Ligand binder design. Structure first.
Ligand SMILES: OC[C@H]1O[C@H](O[C@H]2[C@H](O)[C@@H](O)[C@@H](O)O[C@@H]2CO)[C@H](O)[C@@H](O)[C@@H]1O
Ligand SMILES: OC[C@H]1O[C@H](O[C@H]2[C@H](O)[C@@H](O)[C@@H](O)O[C@@H]2CO)[C@H](O)[C@@H](O)[C@@H]1O
Lengths: 384, 381
C-alpha cells in the first residue's frame, strides 16, 4: 500500500525533520514529486512491522546499527551509487552501511555522545566520573545538580559501561563473534555499579528520561547532560552558556560511546526506488541539503567530504570527534536488535533495583547470545 | 499392510540410525513393542509411494522440506502435542513442520552445510570461493587438492548458487509464491558458472559424489569438503585434524546453504499412532534420547531446549548455526519435490557439460514451476 509517484520519509523526532522537509520542498519544486517527512514513535520497531507486509515509508532514516537486521529480512533495497558518488563520501561511512557484501543504505553523518555542560554553573567540567558525586553534593547546596541524562535508553549509559572493558560483540578475524558478548565481564559490572550507586546516593533518579534531562539542562537546573549533536539546537534556543567536551573517564579509562552513522535506507517494497535515489544523492547529500538539515538539528561529522571546511568552524564537532575516536563503532549485525533490548532491560532493572547488577547483566548476556536467540534469529530472518 | 503392535521407523542412512535403534531398545524394554529401524535407499521417494497404498513405516524421518507434499497427499497424521510438550522445543523448529496451519511432524534438529577443512594441509581456510582455484593449483603440486564435495545432489551446490541471488520460491508477506522461482536469475547463473569453471579447469570433477568426497577428505587427499553435522562422526574416526567453519563468500556475499529441520512424521495409515507419539515425545525427544542418536551421528542444533547444554560447547555446532543464519530455510510446499528434480538435473547437466549454465537454469526454472499453472495458462485461447 505504498503510494507510487510520491516520497514518504521516516526520520526520528530528535533529528532535523523540518530541515529535511525543506529539502523535500525543493525536490518538489524541481520534480513535482510530493515529499512527505514523518517522525513516528518507535519508528525503528514500526518499520520492520510494516515493511514485512510490503508497506511503510519509501526512505527510512536511522543509525546504521539496525540496518543489518532489516537487510537480513530482505526489507531493504540495495543502493546503486556510481563510483563518482561513492567518492563523495568517506569510505568509513560506506563501510557502516555495508551488510553481507552489499550496500544497504546511504550514510549521512557520524554521531557520538558528548559531555554537555553549563559554563555558568560549572566553569570547569569534571575529568572523571569518580568526582561527580562530590560535585553534585556541592551543587545540591545551591539547589542545583551535577548531572542529568536519559536513563531509559542503554545508548546513553553505554559510554560508562564500556569504559572499563565493556563491549557488545567481539571483533575477530574480520567478523563479529556473535557468541563473545562483553556485557557481563568485570568492566561492565563496574561501570553499571557506579551508575547504580549514583542513583542509590540520590545524585540521579532511575526514572529520568530524555525530555526530563533535556528540560532540566536547558532551564539551568543541572550542570551537565549527556547528548548528541541533535540536542545542541534546543540548547542554542535556551540561551544557556554551554560547552561540549570529552566524556569523563572511568577508572582512568575513557568513556566509550557507541559510534552511530545516521543512514537512509530504501524500502524493499518501495515503487519509487529511483526517485528515492535521486533525492538522497542529488538533493540531501549535498552542501545545501545537509546544511538545511544541520540548521534545524546538527547532524554530527557528516559523511559528505565537501562539508569539512564548514564543520571546521564548529568546536562542538571537535568534541564529537574526540568522543567518537574513544568509542566503538556499533555493529550492524541482526543480533543487535536483541542486544539493545537485553541491555535496556538490564540498565533499567539495575537502576530501579528490581535486579542486582550481577543479576541484570547475567540475564543481559543470556538474552543477547544463546541458542534461544539464534533460533529466533532463524525465524526473524524469515519474517521479521 | 502395516502391522499393528510394533513400530517401523525410516531414517536416512547418513543419520544416526544405530543411535536411534538404541532408543527403540529402551522402548521395547518398557512397553514390549519391538522397534525396527530401517534406512532404505531413495527413502524420501519410497515413503510417498508405499504410504499411499497404506504401506510403509509408522514413522518417517526427513528434512522438513518434503513434509508439505506428504501432508497434501494425506500421508501424515496430524500430531497432537500439548502446550506442555510444545514448550520444550524452539518455536522456530515448530514453524518448520507447520503446513496449512496444522503441525504435521515433530522437529528434531536444525541442519546446515558448513565448510570442513583439514588443519594440517590448510591452517587457514579460504574466505572466498574465488581464491580456491589458486589454492588448488598450489595443493596439486603437493599431490593434493583444495576441495571435494558431492556434486550429485543440488543441496550441496545450492549454497553457491544462492550466494549472489539465486532462490527457490519467493517468500513474501506470509506465504511462498509458487510463481516466483529464482533458479534462473543472474545470481543463480553467476554461482553455477563459477562451479562449472572449477570443473572445467579441473579443480573439481563433475562425477564426484558423496562417497568419493568423503573418502578423499577422510584420507587426507583433499584440503576441504562441504557437508553437514552427520558427517563429523566418520571424520572423527579418521583421526584427521579438522575444523568446521563458515562457508566461503562468493562475489563478496556469504554462501547461502539451505536450512533443514530433520523431522519425524507419523504415517496416516499407521494403527500405532499412539505408540509412535509416545516413542517420539517421551523417548527420542529427551536429553537421553537425543544423545544416543547424537553420539552415533551428530544431529546439528537440536530442537529440544534442554539439550542446549552440550551444543553450546561444540564450536562445530556454532559454525553450523553461523552458516544457517546466512542461509535460507527450505520451503515445505508440495512443489519442492519438482523443484529438486529440476535443479538436480540442471546442476548435473551444467557440471557435465550436457547443457550450458544458461540453458540448464532456464529449463530448471521452467520445470521447477507448476504444471497446473502452465496448463491453466494454455486456457487463454
Ligand atoms: O538505546 C538503544 C538505541 O541506541 C541507539 O539509538 C540512538 C540513536 O543512534 C541516536 O541517533 C539517537 O537518536 O539516540 C538513540 C538512543 O535513544 C541505536 O541506534 C538504537 O538502534 C538503539 O535501540
Ligand atoms: O539435494 C536435494 C535434497 O536436498 C535435501 O536433502 C538433504 C537433507 O536435507 C540432509 O538432511 C542430508 O540428508 O542431505 C540431503 C542431500 O542429499 C532435501 O531435504 C531433500 O528433500 C532434497 O532431495
Amino acid at each position: 500500500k505504498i503510494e507510487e509517484g510520491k516520497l514518504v520519509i521516516w526520520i526520528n523526532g530528535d533529528k532535523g525533520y523540518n530541515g529535511l522537509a525543506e529539502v523535500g520542498k525543493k525536490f518538489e519544486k524541481d520534480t513535482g514529486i510530493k515529499v512527505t517527512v514523518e517522525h513516528p514513535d518507535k519508528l525503528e520497531e514500526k518499520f520492520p512491522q510494516v515493511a514485512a507486509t510490503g508497506d511503510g515509508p519509501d526512505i527510512i532514516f536511522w543509525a546504521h546499527d539496525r540496518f543489518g537486521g532489516y537487510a537480513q529480512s530482505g526489507l531493504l533495497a540495495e543502493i546503486t551509487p556510481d563510483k563518482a558518488f561513492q567518492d563523495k563520501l568517506y569510505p568509513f561511512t560506506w563501510d557502516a552501511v555495508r551488510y553481507n557484501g552489499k550496500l544497504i543504505a546511504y550514510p549521512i553523518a557520524v554521531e557520538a555522545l558528548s559531555l554537555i555542560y553549563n559554563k555558568d554553573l560549572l566553569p570547569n567540567p569534571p575529568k572523571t566520573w569518580e568526582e561527580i558525586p562530590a560535585l553534585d553534593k556541592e551543587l545540591k547546596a545551591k539547589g542545583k545538580s551535577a548531572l542529568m541524562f536519559n536513563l531509559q535508553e542503554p545508548y546513553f549509559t553505554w559510554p560508562l559501561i564500556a569504559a572499563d572493558g565493556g563491549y557488545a560483540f567481539k571483533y575477530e578475524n574480520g567478523k563479529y563473534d556473535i557468541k563473545d558478548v562483553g556485557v557481563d565481564n568485570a568492566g561492565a559490572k563496574a561501570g553499571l555499579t557506579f551508575l547504580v550507586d549514583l542513583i542509590k546516593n540520590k545524585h540521579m533518579n532511575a526514572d529520568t528520561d530524555y525530555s526530563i534531562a533535556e528540560a532540566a539542562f536547558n532551564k539551568g537546573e543541572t550542570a551537565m547532560t549527556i547528548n548528541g549533536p541533535w540536542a545542541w539546537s534546543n540548547i542554542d534556543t535556551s540561551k544557556v552558556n554551554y560547552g561540549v567536551t570529552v566524556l569523563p573517564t572511568f577508572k582512568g579509562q575513557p568513556s566509550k560511546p557507541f559510534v552511530g552513522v545516521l543512514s537512509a535506507g530504501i524500502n524493499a517494497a518501495s515503487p519509487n526506488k529511483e526517485l528515492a535515489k535521486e533525492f538522497l544523492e542529488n538533493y540531501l547529500l549535498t552542501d545545501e541539503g545537509l546544511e538545511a538539515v544541520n540548521k534545524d538539528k546538527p547532524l554530527g561529522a557528516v559523511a559528505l567530504k565537501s562539508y569539512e571546511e564548514e564543520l571546521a568552524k564548529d568546536p562542538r564537532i571537535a568534541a564529537t570527534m574526540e568522543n567518537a575516536q574513544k568509542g566503538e563503532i556499533m555493529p550492524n549485525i541482526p543480533q543487535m536488535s536483541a542486544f539493545w533490548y537485553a541491555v535496556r532491560t538490564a540498565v533499567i532493572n539495575a537502576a530501579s533495583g528490581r535486579q542486582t547488577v550481577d543479576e541484570a547483566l547475567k540475564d543481559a548476556q543470556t538474552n543477547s547470545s544463546s541458542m534461544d536467540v539464534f533460533m529466533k534469529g532463524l525465524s526473524k530472518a524469515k519474517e521479521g
